[PDB]
Amino acid sequence: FTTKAPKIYTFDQVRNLVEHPNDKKLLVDVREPKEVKDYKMPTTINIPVNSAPGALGLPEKEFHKVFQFAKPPHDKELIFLCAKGVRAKTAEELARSYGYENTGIYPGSITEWLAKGGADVKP
């Protein structure tokens, strides 16, 4: 549980990460899967904080069974996209509580992201 606050990312830094994925980093969408149906930011993984706040503490095999992707290694940088309210802030704090000490945050919401032209951002 480090004291290092998450690195703040901007629209362009997230647009660059979506267009050119980096194996060191992962963009984490913390919205509910119900909201991801409206728009999923490409290359993101969905870890809903309201539904499963202890998700990043799950055992590896059960994480893959519950979410159908690999539990990220603890060296990966998890960049939490904003939702609205304190969801992303809570998910980042929970990630650091589970050994994920390399974290980031994109303060913009999905609505803010789509308003700035993120709908056609693709890899």
Curated annotation (Swiss-Prot):
<dbReference type="GO" id="GO:0005739">
    <property type="term" value="C:mitochondrion"/>
</dbReference>
<protein>
    <recommendedName>
        <fullName>Thiosulfate sulfurtransferase RDL2, mitochondrial</fullName>
        <ecNumber>2.8.1.1</ecNumber>
    </recommendedName>
</protein>
<comment type="function">
    <text>Thiosulfate sulfurtransferase which catalyzes the transfer of sulfane sulfur from thiosulfate to cyanide.</text>
</comment>
<keyword id="KW-0496">Mitochondrion</keyword>
<keyword id="KW-0809">Transit peptide</keyword>
<feature type="active site" description="Cysteine persulfide intermediate">
    <location>
        <position position="82"/>
    </location>
</feature>
<feature type="domain" description="Rhodanese">
    <location>
        <begin position="21"/>
        <end position="122"/>
    </location>
</feature>
<keyword id="KW-0808">Transferase</keyword>
<dbReference type="GO" id="GO:0006790">
    <property type="term" value="P:sulfur compound metabolic process"/>
</dbReference>
<dbReference type="GO" id="GO:0004792">
    <property type="term" value="F:thiosulfate-cyanide sulfurtransferase activity"/>
</dbReference>
